[PDB]
């Protein structure tokens, strides 16, 4: 099913590339780019969305700041707080400090979120139909922390240990690639100077290599 290649960038859907520093903070960053996609497409508006603000903040849900968390309780966290500040008004400082949400500067929300069926195809008709999806990635290698250029493939990725939180904002084919030739492409938060300007392809029908498809999930609006 669905399109043999999707780019929600070219539909306005992405924010630019962030970077996350010093701080256990992709959880956070995989969240607000799932959230920014989603607000998006609800009111035709992409407004960048505070990290700083679920690291502070999204404690009560089972989020540990700087030293990690998951997606779907920062999602659990703006549909409990009735809002998130957006990322010019609560920037982002890479380190814990009080929580200092405001709602006169909300400029999201959710309802919940749904958590995908753990199968790429799922995953592929979830990015084809939804917008941007949250993802969860066997990250913990070399060859990703070293990562540049091609479709990322590592033969010691594991499906079930996934330590870092990320983006799908489409898919595709390499013209070039053809065997092994499908990929995800996957918005990181390490900043631009990191992968293809802060993208990287991931390997996509390989039987879910690295566990693209395992932790995946997008808030409700
Ligand atoms: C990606 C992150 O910043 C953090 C912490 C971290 C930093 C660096 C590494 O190493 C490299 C190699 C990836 C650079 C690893 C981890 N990771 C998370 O917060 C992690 C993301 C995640 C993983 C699976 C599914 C969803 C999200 N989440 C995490 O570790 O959570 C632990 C946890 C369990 C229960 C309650 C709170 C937190």
């Known amino acids: 099913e669905a399109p ?7 539909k306005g859907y992405v924010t630019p ?13 995989s969240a607000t780019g799932a959230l920014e996609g989603q607000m998006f497409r609800k009111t035709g508006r992409l407004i960048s969305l505070s990290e700083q603000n679920l690291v502070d903040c999204s404690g009560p849900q089972g989020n540990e700041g700087c030293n990690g968390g998951l997606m779907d309780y920062a999602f659990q966290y703006v549909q409990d707080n009735g809002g ?21 500067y909300s400029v999201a929300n959710d309802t919940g979120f749904v958590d995908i069926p753990k199968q790429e195809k799922a995953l592929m008709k979830a990015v084809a139909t939804v917008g941007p999806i949250s993802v969860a990635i066997d990250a913990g290698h070399e060859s990703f922390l070293f ?3 091609g479709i990322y493939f590592e033969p010691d990725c594991s499906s079930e240990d996934m330590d870092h939180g990320v983006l799908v904002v489409g898919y595709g084919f390499e013209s070039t690639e053809s065997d092994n030739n499908k990929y995800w492409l996957v918005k990181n938060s390490w900043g631009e100077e990191w992968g293809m300007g802060g993208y990287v392809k991931m ?12 932790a995946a999930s997008y808030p409700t609006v």
């Open 203 to 214: 390997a996509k029908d390989r039987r879910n290599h690295c566990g693209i498809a395992s």
């Open 17 to 29: 590339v962030k970077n996350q520093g010093q701080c256990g903070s992709c959880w956070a960053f």
């Open 4 to 10: 043999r290649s999707v780019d929600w960038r070219e």
């Open 84 to 104: 998130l500040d957006s990322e010019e008004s609560y920037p982002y400082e890479a380190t814990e400090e009080s929580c200092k949400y405001n709602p006169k």
């Open 147 to 149: 990562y540049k250029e």
